[PDB]
PDB file of all heavy atoms in Angstrom:
ATOM      1  N   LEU A  23       2.860   2.725  -2.157  1.00  0.00           N
ATOM      2  CA  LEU A  23       2.782   3.626  -3.300  1.00  0.00           C
ATOM      3  C   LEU A  23       1.468   4.385  -3.302  1.00  0.00           C
ATOM      4  O   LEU A  23       1.387   5.509  -3.782  1.00  0.00           O
ATOM      5  CB  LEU A  23       2.977   2.877  -4.632  1.00  0.00           C
ATOM      6  CG  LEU A  23       4.396   2.340  -4.926  1.00  0.00           C
ATOM      7  CD1 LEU A  23       4.743   1.164  -4.024  1.00  0.00           C
ATOM      8  CD2 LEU A  23       4.529   1.958  -6.384  1.00  0.00           C
ATOM      9  N   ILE A  24       0.451   3.773  -2.758  1.00  0.00           N
ATOM     10  CA  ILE A  24      -0.850   4.400  -2.652  1.00  0.00           C
ATOM     11  C   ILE A  24      -0.894   5.382  -1.462  1.00  0.00           C
ATOM     12  O   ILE A  24      -1.486   6.466  -1.554  1.00  0.00           O
ATOM     13  CB  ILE A  24      -1.981   3.340  -2.502  1.00  0.00           C
ATOM     14  CG1 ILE A  24      -1.964   2.363  -3.691  1.00  0.00           C
ATOM     15  CG2 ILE A  24      -3.353   4.011  -2.378  1.00  0.00           C
ATOM     16  CD1 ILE A  24      -2.081   3.035  -5.051  1.00  0.00           C
ATOM     17  N   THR A  25      -0.241   5.006  -0.360  1.00  0.00           N
ATOM     18  CA  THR A  25      -0.256   5.815   0.853  1.00  0.00           C
ATOM     19  C   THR A  25       0.519   7.127   0.659  1.00  0.00           C
ATOM     20  O   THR A  25       0.395   8.032   1.443  1.00  0.00           O
ATOM     21  CB  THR A  25       0.330   5.032   2.088  1.00  0.00           C
ATOM     22  OG1 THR A  25      -0.117   5.634   3.316  1.00  0.00           O
ATOM     23  CG2 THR A  25       1.854   5.053   2.070  1.00  0.00           C
ATOM     24  N   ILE A  26       1.309   7.202  -0.411  1.00  0.00           N
ATOM     25  CA  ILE A  26       2.102   8.393  -0.709  1.00  0.00           C
ATOM     26  C   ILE A  26       1.209   9.665  -0.793  1.00  0.00           C
ATOM     27  O   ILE A  26       1.616  10.761  -0.367  1.00  0.00           O
ATOM     28  CB  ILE A  26       2.914   8.218  -2.019  1.00  0.00           C
ATOM     29  CG1 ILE A  26       3.961   7.109  -1.848  1.00  0.00           C
ATOM     30  CG2 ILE A  26       3.578   9.521  -2.422  1.00  0.00           C
ATOM     31  CD1 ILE A  26       4.763   6.816  -3.102  1.00  0.00           C
ATOM     32  N   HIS A  27       0.012   9.504  -1.311  1.00  0.00           N
ATOM     33  CA  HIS A  27      -0.959  10.605  -1.384  1.00  0.00           C
ATOM     34  C   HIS A  27      -1.349  11.105   0.006  1.00  0.00           C
ATOM     35  O   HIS A  27      -1.642  12.273   0.191  1.00  0.00           O
ATOM     36  CB  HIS A  27      -2.213  10.175  -2.158  1.00  0.00           C
ATOM     37  CG  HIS A  27      -2.035  10.157  -3.647  1.00  0.00           C
ATOM     38  ND1 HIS A  27      -2.643   9.237  -4.472  1.00  0.00           N
ATOM     39  CD2 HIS A  27      -1.317  10.957  -4.453  1.00  0.00           C
ATOM     40  CE1 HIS A  27      -2.298   9.473  -5.716  1.00  0.00           C
ATOM     41  NE2 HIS A  27      -1.494  10.513  -5.734  1.00  0.00           N
ATOM     42  N   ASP A  28      -1.329  10.218   0.965  1.00  0.00           N
ATOM     43  CA  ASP A  28      -1.749  10.536   2.332  1.00  0.00           C
ATOM     44  C   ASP A  28      -0.552  10.598   3.275  1.00  0.00           C
ATOM     45  O   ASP A  28      -0.705  10.824   4.486  1.00  0.00           O
ATOM     46  CB  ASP A  28      -2.753   9.486   2.835  1.00  0.00           C
ATOM     47  CG  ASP A  28      -4.077   9.529   2.107  1.00  0.00           C
ATOM     48  OD1 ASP A  28      -4.190   8.910   1.031  1.00  0.00           O
ATOM     49  OD2 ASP A  28      -5.020  10.183   2.612  1.00  0.00           O
ATOM     50  N   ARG A  29       0.643  10.407   2.724  1.00  0.00           N
ATOM     51  CA  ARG A  29       1.839  10.273   3.536  1.00  0.00           C
ATOM     52  C   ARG A  29       2.233  11.560   4.232  1.00  0.00           C
ATOM     53  O   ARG A  29       2.893  11.525   5.249  1.00  0.00           O
ATOM     54  CB  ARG A  29       3.036   9.694   2.736  1.00  0.00           C
ATOM     55  CG  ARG A  29       3.762  10.689   1.864  1.00  0.00           C
ATOM     56  CD  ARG A  29       4.982  10.059   1.214  1.00  0.00           C
ATOM     57  NE  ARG A  29       5.988   9.613   2.207  1.00  0.00           N
ATOM     58  CZ  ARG A  29       7.201   9.126   1.889  1.00  0.00           C
ATOM     59  NH1 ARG A  29       7.600   9.103   0.616  1.00  0.00           N
ATOM     60  NH2 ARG A  29       8.024   8.708   2.854  1.00  0.00           N
ATOM     61  N   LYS A  30       1.840  12.681   3.687  1.00  0.00           N
ATOM     62  CA  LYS A  30       2.189  13.951   4.290  1.00  0.00           C
ATOM     63  C   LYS A  30       1.411  14.170   5.570  1.00  0.00           C
ATOM     64  O   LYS A  30       1.854  14.886   6.469  1.00  0.00           O
ATOM     65  CB  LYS A  30       2.002  15.126   3.309  1.00  0.00           C
ATOM     66  CG  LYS A  30       2.898  15.050   2.072  1.00  0.00           C
ATOM     67  CD  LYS A  30       2.317  14.132   0.999  1.00  0.00           C
ATOM     68  CE  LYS A  30       3.372  13.728  -0.003  1.00  0.00           C
ATOM     69  NZ  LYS A  30       2.786  13.135  -1.226  1.00  0.00           N
ATOM     70  N   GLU A  31       0.260  13.533   5.661  1.00  0.00           N
ATOM     71  CA  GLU A  31      -0.569  13.631   6.834  1.00  0.00           C
ATOM     72  C   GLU A  31      -0.354  12.446   7.730  1.00  0.00           C
ATOM     73  O   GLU A  31       0.249  12.554   8.795  1.00  0.00           O
ATOM     74  CB  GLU A  31      -2.040  13.679   6.445  1.00  0.00           C
ATOM     75  CG  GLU A  31      -2.378  14.714   5.436  1.00  0.00           C
ATOM     76  CD  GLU A  31      -1.993  16.099   5.883  1.00  0.00           C
ATOM     77  OE1 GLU A  31      -2.536  16.570   6.906  1.00  0.00           O
ATOM     78  OE2 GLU A  31      -1.132  16.727   5.227  1.00  0.00           O
ATOM     79  N   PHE A  32      -0.820  11.315   7.270  1.00  0.00           N
ATOM     80  CA  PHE A  32      -0.883  10.120   8.059  1.00  0.00           C
ATOM     81  C   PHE A  32       0.470   9.446   8.191  1.00  0.00           C
ATOM     82  O   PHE A  32       0.939   9.205   9.301  1.00  0.00           O
ATOM     83  CB  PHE A  32      -1.908   9.168   7.453  1.00  0.00           C
ATOM     84  CG  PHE A  32      -1.922   7.787   8.072  1.00  0.00           C
ATOM     85  CD1 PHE A  32      -1.974   7.619   9.453  1.00  0.00           C
ATOM     86  CD2 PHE A  32      -1.875   6.660   7.270  1.00  0.00           C
ATOM     87  CE1 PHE A  32      -1.983   6.359  10.007  1.00  0.00           C
ATOM     88  CE2 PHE A  32      -1.885   5.399   7.823  1.00  0.00           C
ATOM     89  CZ  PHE A  32      -1.940   5.248   9.192  1.00  0.00           C
ATOM     90  N   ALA A  33       1.095   9.145   7.070  1.00  0.00           N
ATOM     91  CA  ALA A  33       2.379   8.437   7.084  1.00  0.00           C
ATOM     92  C   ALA A  33       3.424   9.217   7.835  1.00  0.00           C
ATOM     93  O   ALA A  33       4.280   8.653   8.460  1.00  0.00           O
ATOM     94  CB  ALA A  33       2.851   8.133   5.688  1.00  0.00           C
ATOM     95  N   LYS A  34       3.322  10.537   7.775  1.00  0.00           N
ATOM     96  CA  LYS A  34       4.257  11.434   8.451  1.00  0.00           C
ATOM     97  C   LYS A  34       4.323  11.107   9.953  1.00  0.00           C
ATOM     98  O   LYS A  34       5.339  11.338  10.611  1.00  0.00           O
ATOM     99  CB  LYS A  34       3.815  12.892   8.248  1.00  0.00           C
ATOM    100  CG  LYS A  34       4.889  13.957   8.526  1.00  0.00           C
ATOM    101  CD  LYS A  34       5.940  14.012   7.405  1.00  0.00           C
ATOM    102  CE  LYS A  34       7.144  13.123   7.695  1.00  0.00           C
ATOM    103  NZ  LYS A  34       7.955  13.645   8.818  1.00  0.00           N
ATOM    104  N   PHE A  35       3.240  10.563  10.468  1.00  0.00           N
ATOM    105  CA  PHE A  35       3.153  10.167  11.843  1.00  0.00           C
ATOM    106  C   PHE A  35       3.926   8.889  12.092  1.00  0.00           C
ATOM    107  O   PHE A  35       4.869   8.866  12.886  1.00  0.00           O
ATOM    108  CB  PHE A  35       1.703   9.973  12.236  1.00  0.00           C
ATOM    109  CG  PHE A  35       0.904  11.229  12.246  1.00  0.00           C
ATOM    110  CD1 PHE A  35      -0.382  11.245  11.750  1.00  0.00           C
ATOM    111  CD2 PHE A  35       1.435  12.391  12.762  1.00  0.00           C
ATOM    112  CE1 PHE A  35      -1.131  12.405  11.763  1.00  0.00           C
ATOM    113  CE2 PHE A  35       0.696  13.558  12.781  1.00  0.00           C
ATOM    114  CZ  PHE A  35      -0.589  13.566  12.279  1.00  0.00           C
ATOM    115  N   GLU A  36       3.535   7.835  11.403  1.00  0.00           N
ATOM    116  CA  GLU A  36       4.134   6.518  11.584  1.00  0.00           C
ATOM    117  C   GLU A  36       5.596   6.504  11.162  1.00  0.00           C
ATOM    118  O   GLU A  36       6.395   5.713  11.677  1.00  0.00           O
ATOM    119  CB  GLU A  36       3.351   5.460  10.812  1.00  0.00           C
ATOM    120  CG  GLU A  36       3.295   5.693   9.314  1.00  0.00           C
ATOM    121  CD  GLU A  36       2.554   4.607   8.589  1.00  0.00           C
ATOM    122  OE1 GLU A  36       1.315   4.649   8.561  1.00  0.00           O
ATOM    123  OE2 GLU A  36       3.211   3.692   8.051  1.00  0.00           O
ATOM    124  N   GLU A  37       5.940   7.384  10.234  1.00  0.00           N
ATOM    125  CA  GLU A  37       7.279   7.429   9.654  1.00  0.00           C
ATOM    126  C   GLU A  37       8.386   7.589  10.690  1.00  0.00           C
ATOM    127  O   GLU A  37       9.473   7.097  10.496  1.00  0.00           O
ATOM    128  CB  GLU A  37       7.392   8.484   8.569  1.00  0.00           C
ATOM    129  CG  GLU A  37       6.971   7.991   7.188  1.00  0.00           C
ATOM    130  CD  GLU A  37       7.229   9.004   6.100  1.00  0.00           C
ATOM    131  OE1 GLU A  37       8.296   9.636   6.116  1.00  0.00           O
ATOM    132  OE2 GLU A  37       6.367   9.158   5.199  1.00  0.00           O
ATOM    133  N   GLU A  38       8.103   8.267  11.777  1.00  0.00           N
ATOM    134  CA  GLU A  38       9.106   8.445  12.825  1.00  0.00           C
ATOM    135  C   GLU A  38       9.595   7.092  13.339  1.00  0.00           C
ATOM    136  O   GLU A  38      10.785   6.847  13.422  1.00  0.00           O
ATOM    137  CB  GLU A  38       8.552   9.264  13.970  1.00  0.00           C
ATOM    138  CG  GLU A  38       8.145  10.656  13.582  1.00  0.00           C
ATOM    139  CD  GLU A  38       7.659  11.456  14.756  1.00  0.00           C
ATOM    140  OE1 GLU A  38       8.497  12.068  15.460  1.00  0.00           O
ATOM    141  OE2 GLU A  38       6.429  11.477  14.997  1.00  0.00           O
ATOM    142  N   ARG A  39       8.674   6.251  13.688  1.00  0.00           N
ATOM    143  CA  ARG A  39       8.974   4.916  14.141  1.00  0.00           C
ATOM    144  C   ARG A  39       9.372   4.005  12.957  1.00  0.00           C
ATOM    145  O   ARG A  39      10.417   3.355  12.979  1.00  0.00           O
ATOM    146  CB  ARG A  39       7.751   4.337  14.914  1.00  0.00           C
ATOM    147  CG  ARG A  39       7.992   3.000  15.655  1.00  0.00           C
ATOM    148  CD  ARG A  39       8.021   1.805  14.706  1.00  0.00           C
ATOM    149  NE  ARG A  39       6.787   1.692  13.916  1.00  0.00           N
ATOM    150  CZ  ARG A  39       6.469   0.644  13.149  1.00  0.00           C
ATOM    151  NH1 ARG A  39       7.296  -0.400  13.058  1.00  0.00           N
ATOM    152  NH2 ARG A  39       5.331   0.645  12.473  1.00  0.00           N
TER     153      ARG A  39
END
Side-chain angles (χ1 to χ4, degrees):
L23 290 71
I24 302 304
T25 200
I26 295 177
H27 282 145
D28 292 85
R29 80 175 297 186
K30 297 82 198 195
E31 308 303 298
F32 171 49
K34 197 74 267 291
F35 293 139
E36 60 178 81
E37 274 186 42
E38 298 183 86
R39 189 284 303 190

